[PDB]
């Protein structure tokens, strides 16, 4: 009754660590133990599909595209904050990566429950997340760099 989530770099295919998910009275805490990531803030969201495989868009390969879009059980069709309801329930606070490329700063998602997460995918993006679709869609996270399927 622990279940940790192994994360794999989409570009190299090599493991980069794990993320521990735990339920508490305020939501789901995400405890990262990752490495080999670019320093800075990274878009971090739960995705619709339980897959980290690639997808295809107009002839281009989309790493981790098989995961689909941001988990949106309320069909909000919008990207926002982890503490706002009119947006993807999968929107989490951005994940911090140290100069040494390590991510260890835990983060909380008050709108989520652990049970509803299994079968979905955990995504880490190259860009950050300003929790808006402006000026860039999906908080500007851009490409997907790391992914893992919540079992």
First to last CA, the chain: 11
CB nearer a second copy, residue 77 or residue 98: 98
Kindly state the tokens that stand for 85: 């309801």
Of Cu ion, a second copy, Zn ion, none, which one does residue 81 interact with (CB within 5 to 8 Å by kind)? a second copy
**Phi and psi angles of residue 136, each rounded to the nearest 5 degrees, phi first:** -125, 140
Among the listed residues 42, 47, 70, 131, the single contact to Zn ion using CB under 5 A:
70
Of residues 95 through 124, those in contact with Zn ion by CB under 5 A are: none
Residue 80 binding a second copy, by CB under 8 A? no
Of Cu ion, Zn ion, a second copy, none, which one does residue 37 interact with (CB within 5 to 8 Å by kind)? none
Residues in contact with Cu ion by the rule CB under 5 A: 45, 123
Q: Which long-range contacts does 81-86 make (Cβ < 8 Å, 24+ apart)? A: 81/131, 82/108, 82/109, 82/110, 82/111, 82/131, 83/110, 83/111, 84/131, 85/111
Q: Which residues are annotated as a binding site for Zn(2+)?
A: 70, 79, 88, 91
């Amino acid at each position: 009754q622990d279940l940790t989530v192994k994360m794999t770099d989409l570009q190299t295919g090599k493991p980069v660590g794990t993320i521990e998910l735990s339920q508490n009275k305020y939501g789901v805490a995400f405890i990262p133990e990752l490495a080999d990531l670019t320093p800075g803030m990274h878009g971090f969201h739960i995705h619709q599909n339980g897959s980290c495989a690639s997808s295809e868009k107009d002839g281009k390969v989309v790493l981790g595209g098989a995961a689909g879009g941001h988990y949106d059980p309320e069909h909000t069709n919008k990207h926002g904050f982890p503490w706002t309801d009119d947006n993807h329930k999968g929107d989490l606070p951005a994940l911090f990566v140290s100069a040494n490329g390590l991510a260890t700063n835990p983060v909380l998602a008050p709108r989520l429950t652990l049970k509803e997460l299994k079968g979905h995918a955990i995504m880490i993006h190259a860009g950050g997340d300003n929790h808006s679709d402006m000026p860039k869609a999906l908080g500007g996270g851009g490409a997907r760099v790391a992914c893992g399927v919540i079992q």
